Design a protein around this motif. Structure first.
Motif, PDB file in Angstrom:
ATOM      1  N   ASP A   4       0.804  -1.214   0.000  1.00  0.00           N
ATOM      2  CA  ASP A   4       0.000   0.000   0.000  1.00  0.00           C
ATOM      3  C   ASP A   4       0.839   1.267   0.000  1.00  0.00           C
ATOM      4  OD1 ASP A   4       0.970  -0.250   2.606  1.00  0.00           O
ATOM      5  OD2 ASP A   4      -0.966   0.115   3.567  1.00  0.00           O
ATOM      6  N   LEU A   5       2.157   1.156  -0.162  1.00  0.00           N
ATOM      7  CA  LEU A   5       3.035   2.283   0.132  1.00  0.00           C
ATOM      8  C   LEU A   5       3.018   3.331  -0.971  1.00  0.00           C
ATOM      9  CD1 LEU A   5       6.101   0.406   1.593  1.00  0.00           C
ATOM     10  CD2 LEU A   5       4.496   1.883   2.818  1.00  0.00           C
ATOM     11  N   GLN A  18      -3.420   3.795  -2.437  1.00  0.00           N
ATOM     12  CA  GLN A  18      -3.227   5.222  -2.211  1.00  0.00           C
ATOM     13  C   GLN A  18      -4.428   6.013  -2.697  1.00  0.00           C
ATOM     14  OE1 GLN A  18      -0.691   6.734  -0.572  1.00  0.00           O
ATOM     15  NE2 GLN A  18       0.076   4.694  -0.060  1.00  0.00           N
ATOM     16  N   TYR A  21      -7.241   5.135  -0.040  1.00  0.00           N
ATOM     17  CA  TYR A  21      -7.018   5.848   1.209  1.00  0.00           C
ATOM     18  C   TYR A  21      -7.228   7.340   1.033  1.00  0.00           C
ATOM     19  CZ  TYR A  21      -4.923   1.503   2.832  1.00  0.00           C
ATOM     20  OH  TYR A  21      -4.687   0.198   3.188  1.00  0.00           O
ATOM     21  N   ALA A  22      -6.934   7.867  -0.156  1.00  0.00           N
ATOM     22  CA  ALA A  22      -7.246   9.264  -0.414  1.00  0.00           C
ATOM     23  C   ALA A  22      -8.745   9.478  -0.575  1.00  0.00           C
ATOM     24  CB  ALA A  22      -6.494   9.746  -1.649  1.00  0.00           C
ATOM     25  N   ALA A  25     -10.508   9.390   2.945  1.00  0.00           N
ATOM     26  CA  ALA A  25     -10.107  10.486   3.813  1.00  0.00           C
ATOM     27  C   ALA A  25     -11.149  11.597   3.811  1.00  0.00           C
ATOM     28  CB  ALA A  25      -8.749  11.021   3.372  1.00  0.00           C
ATOM     29  N   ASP A  79      -5.336  21.814   0.532  1.00  0.00           N
ATOM     30  CA  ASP A  79      -5.274  21.147  -0.762  1.00  0.00           C
ATOM     31  C   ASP A  79      -6.377  21.661  -1.682  1.00  0.00           C
ATOM     32  OD1 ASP A  79      -4.678  19.379  -2.822  1.00  0.00           O
ATOM     33  OD2 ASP A  79      -5.150  17.579  -1.675  1.00  0.00           O
ATOM     34  N   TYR A 118      -1.557  14.106 -10.591  1.00  0.00           N
ATOM     35  CA  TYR A 118      -1.129  13.957  -9.205  1.00  0.00           C
ATOM     36  C   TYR A 118      -1.473  12.602  -8.601  1.00  0.00           C
ATOM     37  CZ  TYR A 118       0.926  18.464  -8.712  1.00  0.00           C
ATOM     38  OH  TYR A 118       1.777  19.540  -8.822  1.00  0.00           O
ATOM     39  N   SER A 122       4.959   8.916  -8.053  1.00  0.00           N
ATOM     40  CA  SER A 122       5.225   8.365  -6.737  1.00  0.00           C
ATOM     41  C   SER A 122       5.766   9.388  -5.754  1.00  0.00           C
ATOM     42  CB  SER A 122       6.218   7.211  -6.854  1.00  0.00           C
ATOM     43  OG  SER A 122       7.468   7.684  -7.317  1.00  0.00           O
ATOM     44  N   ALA A 123       6.308  10.507  -6.236  1.00  0.00           N
ATOM     45  CA  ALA A 123       6.851  11.510  -5.327  1.00  0.00           C
ATOM     46  C   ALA A 123       5.751  12.324  -4.665  1.00  0.00           C
ATOM     47  CB  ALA A 123       7.813  12.435  -6.068  1.00  0.00           C
ATOM     48  N   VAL A 124       4.553  12.325  -5.237  1.00  0.00           N
ATOM     49  CA  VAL A 124       3.453  13.107  -4.705  1.00  0.00           C
ATOM     50  C   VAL A 124       2.353  12.153  -4.277  1.00  0.00           C
ATOM     51  CG1 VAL A 124       4.023  15.028  -6.210  1.00  0.00           C
ATOM     52  CG2 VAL A 124       2.237  13.409  -6.879  1.00  0.00           C
ATOM     53  N   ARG A 125       1.475  12.655  -3.450  1.00  0.00           N
ATOM     54  CA  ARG A 125       0.322  11.884  -3.037  1.00  0.00           C
ATOM     55  C   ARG A 125      -0.886  12.252  -3.879  1.00  0.00           C
ATOM     56  NH1 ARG A 125       0.461  15.589   1.401  1.00  0.00           N
ATOM     57  NH2 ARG A 125      -1.254  17.103   1.228  1.00  0.00           N
ATOM     58  N   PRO A 126      -1.912  11.407  -3.906  1.00  0.00           N
ATOM     59  CA  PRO A 126      -3.200  11.845  -4.441  1.00  0.00           C
ATOM     60  C   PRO A 126      -3.823  12.890  -3.536  1.00  0.00           C
ATOM     61  CG  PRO A 126      -3.048   9.470  -4.492  1.00  0.00           C
ATOM     62  CD  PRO A 126      -1.895   9.952  -3.674  1.00  0.00           C
ATOM     63  N   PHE A 127      -4.695  13.696  -4.130  1.00  0.00           N
ATOM     64  CA  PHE A 127      -5.333  14.773  -3.391  1.00  0.00           C
ATOM     65  C   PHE A 127      -6.318  14.217  -2.379  1.00  0.00           C
ATOM     66  CE2 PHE A 127      -4.901  17.974  -7.121  1.00  0.00           C
ATOM     67  CZ  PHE A 127      -3.552  18.053  -6.874  1.00  0.00           C
ATOM     68  N   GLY A 128      -6.554  14.992  -1.331  1.00  0.00           N
ATOM     69  CA  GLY A 128      -7.492  14.601  -0.300  1.00  0.00           C
ATOM     70  C   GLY A 128      -8.742  15.450  -0.344  1.00  0.00           C
TER      71      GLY A 128
ATOM     72  N   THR E   8       4.370  11.793   1.905  1.00  0.00           N
ATOM     73  CA  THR E   8       3.630  11.386   0.721  1.00  0.00           C
ATOM     74  C   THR E   8       2.670  10.245   1.025  1.00  0.00           C
ATOM     75  OG1 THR E   8       5.456  12.141  -0.666  1.00  0.00           O
ATOM     76  CG2 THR E   8       3.960  10.550  -1.645  1.00  0.00           C
ATOM     77  N   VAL E   9       3.022   9.380   1.965  1.00  0.00           N
ATOM     78  CA  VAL E   9       2.277   8.144   2.168  1.00  0.00           C
ATOM     79  C   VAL E   9       0.979   8.446   2.901  1.00  0.00           C
ATOM     80  CG1 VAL E   9       2.321   5.841   3.125  1.00  0.00           C
ATOM     81  CG2 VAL E   9       4.419   6.868   2.227  1.00  0.00           C
ATOM     82  N   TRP E  10      -0.144   8.119   2.271  1.00  0.00           N
ATOM     83  CA  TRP E  10      -1.421   8.160   2.961  1.00  0.00           C
ATOM     84  C   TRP E  10      -1.501   7.044   3.982  1.00  0.00           C
ATOM     85  CZ3 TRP E  10      -5.239  11.654   2.980  1.00  0.00           C
ATOM     86  CH2 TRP E  10      -5.235  12.618   1.975  1.00  0.00           C
ATOM     87  N   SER E  11      -2.161   7.323   5.086  1.00  0.00           N
ATOM     88  CA  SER E  11      -2.397   6.281   6.058  1.00  0.00           C
ATOM     89  C   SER E  11      -3.544   5.400   5.593  1.00  0.00           C
ATOM     90  CB  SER E  11      -2.729   6.890   7.411  1.00  0.00           C
ATOM     91  OG  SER E  11      -1.648   7.667   7.898  1.00  0.00           O
ATOM     92  N   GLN E  13      -5.929   4.826   7.421  1.00  0.00           N
ATOM     93  CA  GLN E  13      -7.076   5.537   7.947  1.00  0.00           C
ATOM     94  C   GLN E  13      -7.222   6.903   7.298  1.00  0.00           C
ATOM     95  OE1 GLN E  13      -6.306   5.576  12.101  1.00  0.00           O
ATOM     96  NE2 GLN E  13      -6.523   3.355  12.327  1.00  0.00           N
ATOM     97  N   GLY E  14      -6.283   7.280   6.434  1.00  0.00           N
ATOM     98  CA  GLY E  14      -6.344   8.543   5.738  1.00  0.00           C
ATOM     99  C   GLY E  14      -5.767   9.734   6.471  1.00  0.00           C
ATOM    100  N   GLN E 114       2.066  24.830   1.063  1.00  0.00           N
ATOM    101  CA  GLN E 114       1.392  23.628   0.572  1.00  0.00           C
ATOM    102  C   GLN E 114       2.373  22.648  -0.058  1.00  0.00           C
ATOM    103  OE1 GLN E 114      -0.415  20.758   0.162  1.00  0.00           O
ATOM    104  NE2 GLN E 114      -2.065  22.228   0.509  1.00  0.00           N
ATOM    105  N   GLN E 118       3.163  18.279   0.310  1.00  0.00           N
ATOM    106  CA  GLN E 118       2.617  17.341  -0.654  1.00  0.00           C
ATOM    107  C   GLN E 118       3.687  16.563  -1.388  1.00  0.00           C
ATOM    108  OE1 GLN E 118       0.277  19.210  -3.644  1.00  0.00           O
ATOM    109  NE2 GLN E 118      -0.065  17.299  -4.740  1.00  0.00           N
ATOM    110  N   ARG E 119       4.752  17.222  -1.819  1.00  0.00           N
ATOM    111  CA  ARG E 119       5.817  16.504  -2.492  1.00  0.00           C
ATOM    112  C   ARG E 119       6.746  15.875  -1.468  1.00  0.00           C
ATOM    113  NH1 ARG E 119       7.497  20.675  -7.360  1.00  0.00           N
ATOM    114  NH2 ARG E 119       5.502  20.574  -8.485  1.00  0.00           N
ATOM    115  N   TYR E 120       7.698  15.116  -1.966  1.00  0.00           N
ATOM    116  CA  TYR E 120       8.696  14.481  -1.131  1.00  0.00           C
ATOM    117  C   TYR E 120       9.993  15.264  -1.229  1.00  0.00           C
ATOM    118  CZ  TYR E 120      11.803  10.854   0.679  1.00  0.00           C
ATOM    119  OH  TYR E 120      12.749  10.152   1.387  1.00  0.00           O
TER     120      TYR E 120
END
Lengths: 240, 191, 201, 228, 238, 215, 213
Positions: A4-5, A18, A21-22, A25, A79, A118, A122-128, E8-11, E13-14, E114, E118-120
């Motif tokens: 899940d990383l 990901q 989980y986004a 959230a 965000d 986005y 892999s360097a960024v997360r999906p939006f929440g 970057t990593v979502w939990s 649980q979010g 922001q 968001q980025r790493y």
């Protein structure tokens, strides 16, 4: 799960955790609905005061991107502010390069590609975030859109984003949406927000209503909700 | 050289001479001076040739891409805006006599004019080219508001006739273009 | 504008005028041309003010950094070398700068000549400016190596007097500096009219 | 875990900065005391060999004509920071014809005391004492690897700094004199050192407003030692 | 727990625990309280020291002629955002030749913060800003967060044990709006004296008060215009 | 722009009590040919200020586009703050200066009139970055021709009415029709107040030619 | 072609006193053979102890004024103190050399007090050199004003006339008379005069009109 990383890897069954989980959230965020009428689009957000420390008019999730387009966001707030800035930038570029108002489908597709990009790397997360897009045009009518955290963006008549996502659209669909003008739909959205979660888990909430359509001549703005005061004189009659 | 664009109630009527010249020598005796971009929208060019051809190609690219992404018919003002942006972006190198016209479902027939400068304006009629000053002298004499199609054809016929007769660079043969709601009617006349 | 410099047994003589005009209009009469670089270095202002001021201030900066990195006082040829390598990076772009570099060395006296044309040379006598050739004449009349101190003072004073006498672009107060082995010292700042009364008869 | 500068703790904190503060401790000690007469300052050299030439190891360096320094920790991070200060002071005099005051010196150093970043390197491993005289009299200044700079009246650093600060607060008050603070400091030095105090172990750096030049004492320090 | 390492990593649980760890890093700062009247905005912070001989670390620092900030959390990010803040002031001061509205400035702060959330490759900023300003519509007291969800209030307080301060703000937010500057400031330190354990007293050297007014330029004070503000007090009700 | 293709002509603006009136004509001459005899040369900015310009009309379209985007941006901030006209004047001056500094001029000569918070404003912006305030502006040949009429009446009377100023603008535009080759007998009058911004229609002048009967 | 320069004119005067700095200038902004306005003060108050005047190309005057104010705020907001006069002089000199290959066509005069509380006038040039003098006249009326100040302030070319130090009110009468005498003959001069005086207690201003042609 485990597996899940990073947002670029797949799962052994083939989905991206990901993205999931986004998605869930925004489920914990406040309830935000939307519904259009035959000549306009109405927004409405269940917004909460923390305890006694707010000011009733700060950090409003009803944004306003374009002259006729504004957001009704829910999820992570900053965000949503960043994504609102990207929307403002894109509408500015269309106005610069084409000389007229942005059509809402094209705007939604560009924002959906931004969301999707986005989700890709892999360097960024999906939006929440999960938000609404409403508009009005005299040659196009009312269009009401909807954007998930993944990037699947398509249209509704009505929506809900928050905890009571199912529990709002349970009774949004029993509204006679086509034959009504949006001034009725104002107190409709008032009763929909007011029925769900009066006092149960939290203490107090507060109502905002954004408003675009034929009555505003293409403008998008918050109602004078204090004018005609549609919620509370109907809310006290909606408890029975 | 000499180009001409007249709208009427249904749509627009275009027109040009041919005679692409270099110095005093005619390089080309007959030339398609008007250019389709979209199926209801033309443009007619003047000034240098290669500049206008490259600009027509790039505008065709962007406008077709934009219209396919809209999945809708484009606007005439959209192509006017694209020509305005690209002419003003490189006005230090370009000499364009672009006139954009064509029928639109939302707005009927429209005529926009782009001279060498980069300005954009909507008109009821337009001239263009070096040999355009003469029929520009009497286009405010003979034109009447509220013509029909055949009246506009005869109007542009006499206009291009006198321009091709009088100007040295003008001449050749008369090319016409009829755009309305219905269809595109081109013909080549002489007289 | 006229500067000169000549070294001898007891250090270096540096003298210049203080007139800096603006074409046919005199701007000032009290332009201190001989720019004090350090307690041990002295540069002049020769043709164009901003270039002389800026690039000698940058040279003073770099000399201070050199000293603080090496715990050691910089040599004179070092300063002329760095100045020429800095100025040569704008060749053809129209900088006018013809200063001189003076200072005491471990080799002893130090006298170099740096142009905006990059004409880095040493020597014994130099004179820069429009009326410099007057100063060349009167100095090479009066030059020796074994001069005294007051002899050299009156020599350079005579020299700047002659240069400001014949040229129209020169005048003002006559500055007079003296480099020693330990450190430089201002000698005097004499006005021309006092020198004309004093020396005319 | 804690594995890198780009990760907080569940309670705080870095957890890289903490290990830099731990890496303060390995160095030799140094003591400076601010007195309105002027700032006195001291250090231990910790000479290993007789071949080890004592005047070659730098502890007090000269940034400006009225500004001293002392280093504590990794030598070469300190040399880089001294190099940058030597550049920046000269630029301030360049652009203003005046002396950069020592607090502004320390703000300029602590601008990138933490600009540590490997993408978009490591944080530095030295704590520094700054002594100087601005317009407001003498100034004694104490920074850290974390850039949290504050003024200190009499700061001690490095190894055995605890009892040094203890016996220092035992003896200090606001209205000290110069040579009394000098001997009071070197008492604490020969209480925290392991070797016999002599001309090669320590060195002093004294700056005064009327004695701005030569922030150093050379072999008169022998005479100061023999008075105890 | 292997997912609680990076931004970057979502939990599952979010909840990004990097944000909450940044919040807990903010909570270890000094106490400070910001509160406004209709005409005057006053923010009051608390100083601390390394030792007795050492000076006190300042918290309230100047920004602009009508903007001044409080701070809690990191110091390098504090001066970094200070430099960015002054730059954003003087840029529009150069271009538009006007003083800024505060709201668009703090939106710029959120958009600035922001990207390191968001980025790493860059940590989120441990930051405790309380911003007082004057646009055309009067004073504003904004607060920040490492999650860049800037909040507008009328009276807030952040740092260690600031909850008693918040309850004091609850029981006097009706009273703050009408009074003039003096008792407003002593209300502020009647929040700060409950941000302390009761076995010691708030002294001179540990406090600083900054007033900016609708006609008054932003000014920081330390012990000297504060000894006038430190009189006019009673003891705590022991 | 090294060489302006299609130039405008003189623009007139003057304060009065609680408002500023600005009027310019509608002519798009290219060289000596009046090629574009129906154009608009005054942009109505939001509620307070207003732009009028001369010189290259495409550059004016460009600045119209950019200023409209900026104004709509601040209006969609929703913060209740707008631009003072002096802020617009400051931004435009900086824009023209940074434009000309790169050896590419925008061939313009601009007049900003704005009324905000009780105080009138009348701003000038040159191509070269020359910018100042004045109770009366006159650009191009207007500074040669109608400027002494403005400076005559303002010295004779420092304040004005709306009607007096409007008639005076009528007389000055009549004069500019009398002896400017780049003028045209069709012009539009724009006026700002506290009540908002109003652009009148394409008005005309009334000439005299009784001197032609003489020899 | 496009020329990047135009001569706006101007006239700036400065006098270094015993404990004062007087800077005065007319407010006419003209171009070619017309008058743009009769109110534009070339003088600007930087701090309590520093006034700058800038003549020449007007746009560079405005831009330079704004950049100088920006760097004043930078120094104060970095170093908790205002600048001296000569520090501002060095800073302006570095800026004017920083645009060496495309110069400001702007004359500059900084007047103000030193740290001793005495008057100090720093003259300038369009390329960026400077010096501490007692009096300068900047602008088109430079030559119309410099020899008279040599006569009165410097007492030059005189015999048996001792040196009295310049008072305040005598200097005020001097400034009024020199601007009247220059306004009689210059064309870039008239209609007003903005006189600024720097004391150890603040900045005084005073507007004296002139003839209206």
């Amino acid at each position: 799960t485990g597996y899940d990383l990073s947002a670029s890897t797949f799962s052994p069954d083939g989905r991206v955790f990901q993205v999931e989980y986004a998605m869930k959230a925004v489920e914990n965020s406040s309830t935000a609905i939307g519904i259009r009428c035959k000549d306009g689009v109405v927004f409405g957000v269940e917004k909460l005061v923390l305890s006694k420390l707010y000011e009733e008019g700060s950090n409003k999730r009803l944004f306003n991107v374009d002259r006729h387009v504004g957001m009704a966001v829910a999820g992570l707030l900053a965000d949503a502010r960043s994504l609102a800035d990207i929307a403002r930038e894109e509408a500015s570029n269309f106005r610069s390069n084409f000389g007229y108002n942005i059509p809402l489908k094209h705007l939604a597709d560009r924002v959906a590609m931004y969301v999707h990009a986005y989700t890709l790397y892999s360097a960024v997360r999906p939006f929440g975030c999960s938000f609404m897009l409403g508009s009005y045009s005299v040659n196009d009518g009312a269009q009401l859109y909807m954007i998930d955290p993944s990037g699947v963006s398509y249209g509704y008549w009505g929506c809900a984003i928050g905890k009571a996502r199912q529990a709002a659209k349970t009774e949004i669909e029993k509204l006679q949406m086509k034959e009504m003008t949006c001034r009725d739909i104002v107190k409709e959205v008032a009763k929909i927000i007011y029925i769900v979660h009066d006092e149960v888990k939290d203490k107090a909430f507060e109502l905002e209503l954004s408003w675009v359509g034929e009555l505003t001549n293409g403008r998008h703005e918050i109602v004078p909700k204090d004018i005609r005061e549609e919620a509370e004189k109907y809310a006290k009659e909606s408890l029975k | 050289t000499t180009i001409m664009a007249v709208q009427f109630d249904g749509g627009v009527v275009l027109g040009a001479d041919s005679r692409t010249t270099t110095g005093s020598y005619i390089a080309n005796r007959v030339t398609d001076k008007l250019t389709p971009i979209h199926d209801r929208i033309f443009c007619c060019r003047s000034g240098s040739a290669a500049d206008t051809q490259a600009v027509a190609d790039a505008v065709t690219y962007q406008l077709g891409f934009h219209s396919i992404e809209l999945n809708e018919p484009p606007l005439v003002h959209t192509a006017a805006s694209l020509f305005k942006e690209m002419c003003y972006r490189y006005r230090e190198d370009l000499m364009a006599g672009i006139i954009i016209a064509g029928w639109d479902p939302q707005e009927g027939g429209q005529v926009y004019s782009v001279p060498m400068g980069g300005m954009m304006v909507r008109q009821s009629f337009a001239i263009g080219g070096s040999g355009s000053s003469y029929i520009y002298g009497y286009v405010d004499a003979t034109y009447r508001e509220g013509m029909t199609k055949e009246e506009c054809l005869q109007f542009t016929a006499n206009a291009l006739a006198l321009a091709m007769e009088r100007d040295g660079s003008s001449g050749g043969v008369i090319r016409l273009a009829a755009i309305a709601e219905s269809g595109v009617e081109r013909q080549v006349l002489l007289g | 504008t006229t500067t000169l410099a000549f070294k001898f047994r007891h250090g270096v003589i540096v003298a210049a005028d203080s007139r800096a005009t603006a074409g046919a209009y005199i701007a000032s009469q009290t332009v201190k041309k001989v720019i004090e670089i350090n307690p041990y270095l002295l540069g002049t202002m020769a043709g164009g003010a901003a270039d002389c001021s800026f690039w000698e201030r940058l040279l003073a900066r770099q000399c201070r950094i050199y000293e603080l990195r090496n715990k050691e006082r910089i040599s004179v040829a070092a300063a002329s070398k760095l100045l020429a390598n800095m100025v040569y990076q704008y060749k053809g772009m129209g900088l006018s700068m013809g200063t001189m570099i003076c200072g005491w060395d471990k080799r002893g006296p130090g006298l170099y000549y740096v142009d905006s044309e990059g004409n880095r040379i040493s020597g014994a006598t130099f004179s820069v400016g429009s009326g410099s050739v007057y100063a060349y004449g009167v100095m090479d009349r009066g030059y020796s190596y074994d001069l005294e101190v007051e002899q050299a003072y009156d020599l350079a004073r005579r020299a700047i007097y002659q240069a400001t006498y014949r040229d129209a672009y020169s005048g003002g107060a006559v500055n007079l500096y003296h480099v020693r082995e330990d450190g430089w010292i201002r000698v005097s700042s004499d006005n021309v009219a006092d020198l004309h009364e004093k020396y005319s008869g | 875990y804690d594995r890198g500068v780009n990760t907080f703790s569940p309670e705080g904190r870095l957890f890289q900065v903490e290990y830099a503060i731990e890496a303060i401790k390995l160095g030799s000690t140094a003591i400076g005391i601010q007195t309105s007469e002027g700032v006195c300052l001291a250090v231990e050299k910790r000479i290993t060999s007789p071949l080890m030439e004592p005047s070659s190891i730098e502890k007090i360096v000269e940034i400006d004509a009225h500004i001293g320094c002392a280093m504590s920790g990794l030598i070469a991070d300190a040399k880089t920071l001294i190099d940058k200060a030597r550049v920046e002071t000269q630029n301030h005099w360049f652009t203003y014809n005046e002396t950069m005051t020592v607090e502004s010196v320390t703000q300029a150093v602590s601008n990138l005391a933490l600009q540590f970043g490997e993408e978009d390197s490591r944080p530095f491993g030295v704590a520094l004492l700054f002594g100087g005289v601005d317009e407001k009299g003498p100034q004694l200044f104490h920074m850290d690897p974390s850039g949290t700079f504050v003024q200190c009246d009499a700061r001690a650093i490095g190894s055995a700094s605890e009892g040094a600060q203890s016996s220092l607060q035992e003896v200090y008050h606001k209205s000290m004199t110069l040579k009394e603070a000098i001997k009071s400091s070197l008492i604490i030095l020969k209480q925290v050192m392991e070797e016999k105090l002599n001309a090669t172990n320590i060195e002093l750096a004294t700056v005064q407003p009327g004695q701005n030049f030569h922030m150093f004492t050379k072999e008169e320090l022998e005479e100061v030692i023999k008075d105890i | 727990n292997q997912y609680d390492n990076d931004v970057t990593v979502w939990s599952p649980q979010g909840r990004i625990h990097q944000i909450e760890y940044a919040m807990e890093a903010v909570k270890q700062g000094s106490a400070t309280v910001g509160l406004k009247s209709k005409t005057h905005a006053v923010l009051v912070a608390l100083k601390r020291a390394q030792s007795e001989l050492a000076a006190h670390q300042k918290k309230i620092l100047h920004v602009d002629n009508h903007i001044g900030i409080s701070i809690a959390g990191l110091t390098a990010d504090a001066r970094l955002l200070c430099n960015f803040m002054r730059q954003e002031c003087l840029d529009s001061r150069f271009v538009f030749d006007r003083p800024l509205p505060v709201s668009r400035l703090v939106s710029l702060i959120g958009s600035k913060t922001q990207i390191p959330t968001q980025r790493y490759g860059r940590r989120p900023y441990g930051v405790g800003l309380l911003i007082a300003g004057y646009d055309d519509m009067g004073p504003h007291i904004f607060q920040t967060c490492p999650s860049a969800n800037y909040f507008d209030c009328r009276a807030m307080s952040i740092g260690a044990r600031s909850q008693s301060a918040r309850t004091y703000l609850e029981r006097h937010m009706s009273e703050f709006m009408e009074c003039n500057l003096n008792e407003l400031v002593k209300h502020g330190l009647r929040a700060l004296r409950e941000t302390l354990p009761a076995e010691q007293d708030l002294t001179t050297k540990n406090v600083s008060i900054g007033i900016v007014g609708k006609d008054l330029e932003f000014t920081i004070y330390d012990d000297d215009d504060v000894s006038p503000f430190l009189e006019g007090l009673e003891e705590r009700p022991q | 722009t090294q060489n302006p293709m299609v130039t405008g002509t003189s623009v007139l603006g003057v304060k009065f009590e609680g408002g500023v009136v600005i009027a310019a004509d509608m002519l798009g001459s290219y060289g000596s040919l009046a090629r574009f005899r129906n154009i608009s040369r005054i942009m109505r900015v939001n509620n307070s200020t207003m732009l009028g310009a001369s010189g290259d009309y495409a550059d004016f379209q460009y600045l119209k586009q950019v200023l409209g985007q900026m104004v709509i941006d601040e209006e969609l901030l929703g913060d209740g703050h707008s631009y003072s006209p002096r802020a617009i004047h400051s931004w435009l001056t900086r824009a023209m200066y940074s434009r000309r500094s790169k050896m590419n001029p925008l061939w313009n000569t601009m007049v900003i009139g704005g009324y905000a918070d009780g105080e009138s404003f009348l701003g000038y912006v040159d191509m070269l970055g020359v910018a100042y305030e004045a109770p009366s502006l006159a650009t191009g040949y207007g500074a040669y021709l109608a400027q002494p009429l403005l400076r005559e009446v303002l010295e004779k009377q420092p304040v004005l009415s709306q009607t007096e100023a409007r008639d005076l603008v009528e007389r000055c535009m009549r004069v500019l029709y009398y002896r400017d080759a780049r003028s045209y007998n069709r012009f539009q009058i724009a006026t700002v107040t506290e009540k908002g911004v109003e652009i009148e229609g394409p008005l005309s002048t009334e000439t005299n030619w009784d001197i032609a009967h003489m020899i | 072609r496009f020329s990047p320069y135009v001569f706006n004119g101007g006239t700036i005067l400065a006098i270094a006193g015993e404990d004062f700095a007087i800077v005065a200038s007319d407010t006419r902004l003209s171009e070619g053979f017309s008058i743009h306005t009769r109110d534009s003060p070339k003088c600007y108050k930087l701090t309590d102890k520093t006034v700058i005047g800038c003549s020449g190309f007007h746009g560079d005057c405005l831009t330079l004024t704004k950049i100088i104010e920006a760097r004043l705020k930078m120094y104060k907001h970095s170093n908790n103190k205002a600048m001296t006069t000569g520090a501002i002089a060095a800073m302006l000199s570095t800026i004017l050399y920083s645009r060496r290959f495309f110069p400001y066509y702007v004359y500059n005069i900084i007047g103000g007090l030193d740290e001793e509380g005495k008057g100090a006038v720093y003259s300038f040039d369009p390329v960026g050199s400077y010096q501490r003098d007692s009096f300068k006249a900047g602008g088109s009326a430079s030559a119309m004003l410099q020899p008279l100040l040599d006569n009165q302030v410097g007492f030059k070319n005189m015999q048996n006339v001792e040196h009295v130090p310049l008072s305040l009110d005598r200097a005020m009468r001097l400034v009024k008379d020199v601007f009247i005498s220059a306004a009689e003959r210059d064309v870039y001069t008239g209609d007003a005069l903005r006189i600024c005086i720097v004391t150890k207690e603040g900045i005084r201003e005073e507007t004296v009109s002139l003839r209206k042609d």
